[PDB]
Design brief:
Oligomer: homotetramer
Assembly: hexameric
Distance between the termini of chain A: 28 Å
Strand order of the largest sheet of chain A: 1-2
Bound molecules: nickel (II) ion
Number of domains of chain A: 2
Shape of chain A: globular
CATH architecture of the largest domain in chain A: Orthogonal Bundle
Helix content of chain A: 55-70%
Largest interface: C-D, 20 and 21 residues
CATH topology of the largest domain in chain A: Arc Repressor Mutant, subunit A
Chains A, B, C, D: diphtheria TOX repressor
Entry title: diphtheria TOX repressor (C102D mutant)/TOX DNA operator complex
Structural class of chain A: mainly alpha
PDB class: gene regulation/dna
Order of helices and strands of chain A: HHHEEHHH
CATH superfamily of the largest domain in chain A: Winged helix-like DNA-binding domain superfamily/Winged helix DNA-binding domain
Strand content of chain A: 5-15%
Keywords: complex (regulatory protein-DNA), diphtheria TOX repressor, transcription regulation, DNA-binding regulatory protein, iron-regulated repressor, DNA- protein, DNA-repressor complex, gene regulation-DNA complex
Largest sheet of chain A: 2 strands, antiparallel
Chain lengths: 118, 118, 118, 118
DNA sequence: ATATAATTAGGATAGCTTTACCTAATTATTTTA
DNA sequence: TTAAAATAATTAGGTAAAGCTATCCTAATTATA
């Protein structure tokens, strides 16, 4: 479960960029282990809510709005990994898949603090 | 957003009992801010999946597995409320509403782990 | 299988009218044994290609274009039943379900003759 | 429209054999007027569904089942062509393209029936 | 070499699902007073 | 007592978000023969 799709599409597109890879639905599908039309369907919804724009080369252009939570998820995701890895002391082989869920329920306030206490 | 529906409906039925209220769809609705037909419907499915039985008095009765879950969610819910308050240091007023979300996203590993560290 | 959905939707909306019933997406889901979301998705498409229009009382209002194939299917449906019932001599118990498929592959060409020969 | 794809891919392979041609996907692509990858991927499903095996020579090997199908469609195809020509008295030039459709929609009952009547 | 004969890569559509929620009416149920 | 106030639930008819398989397609690249 993605806990939240939209956010995992935004986060993924962001990572894809960090990697110098071109964000193409083909990757989001690959990366999220989803069907091609599912991806197309959702990116369509996201495009409608002005979170992303599908370029003329199919590449996915994040709108400034989309880019923002794109970052926030990335931000909380990292924080969760630390919080999990540092203080809670859970197994590192499991810190990601856990933060992968928390990133979608962590609030800005808990974020704002976690950085203060981490 | 309930993050996870089945788990909240369960936690709630387990909360009602804890305070001597007769677990009735009528209450879940008002507790969870949902419509009567929605509630009568989600429950129906919870029954199907064999998590809760709607006894003759019209009361909801958590099957053995249903209860198991109920207790687990509660377990994590309390664990979260603590981790937040104690360590994370989040504002007590908002600690319930965060725990309300984290409870469904927290793993047993982190549970068992938090049981100690916390 | 419906061999052709759009047609079995039009044909259905027509029959419904004949029975003086009000054609609601809910009656198609019924007769066609399809999920509600499906019916809405397809009507959506049918409304996009201009075959039907959804009134303000959810009632489905065919378009003159919709109405025509609506009739044509009905018409080819009747001939197929005769053709099967009369000349081929197939079991009357199975003349419908058969015609239910042929209606969608019977050409005007064959329609025009079948009438002249039946 | 092929009405039923699998069934036309079978009748085609069965037709290629009948005339000596080596059934190769390229052949099906030409006969069915379909793209090369389309043909390659459709034949894959058929393989998975154990209808036809792709021998080393890259040739299409109808499995007993596949064969059984191919022969049925063929039967129906011929039978439909006659009924049209003989009884329906349709224009001999359009008889094939009509039969081409009725084959996938005609039942065995009608099959066995026309076997006599016709 | 060529030609074919197939892939790769990346899409699109039409059809279908189950979850999970909702508004407007009507029936039940209970209890009662 | 015994039928109205509430109380608790259905009915009826949708909605939106997620996902999925079958079918087709256009280029550009590789095999095979
Ligand atoms: Ni990570
Ligand atoms: Ni995630
Ligand atoms: Ni609490
Ligand atoms: Ni919760
Ligand atoms: Ni009929
Ligand atoms: Ni039909
Ligand atoms: Ni022929
Ligand atoms: Ni055909």
């Amino acid at each position: 479960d993605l806990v939240d799709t939209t956010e995992m599409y935004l986060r993924t597109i962001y990572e894809l960029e960090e990697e110098g890879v071109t964000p193409l639905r083909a990757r989001i599908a690959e990366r999220l282990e989803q069907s091609g039309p599912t991806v197309s369907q959702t990116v369509a919804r996201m495009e409608r809510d002005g979170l992303v724009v599908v370029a003329s080369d199919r590449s996915l252009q994040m709108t400034p709005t989309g880019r923002t939570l794109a970052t926030a998820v990335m931000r909380k995701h990292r924080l969760a990994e630390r919080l999990l890895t540092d203080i809670i002391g859970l197994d590192i082989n499991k810190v990601h898949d856990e933060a992968d869920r928390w990133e979608h329920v962590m609030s800005d306030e808990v974020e704002r603090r976690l950085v203060k206490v981490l």
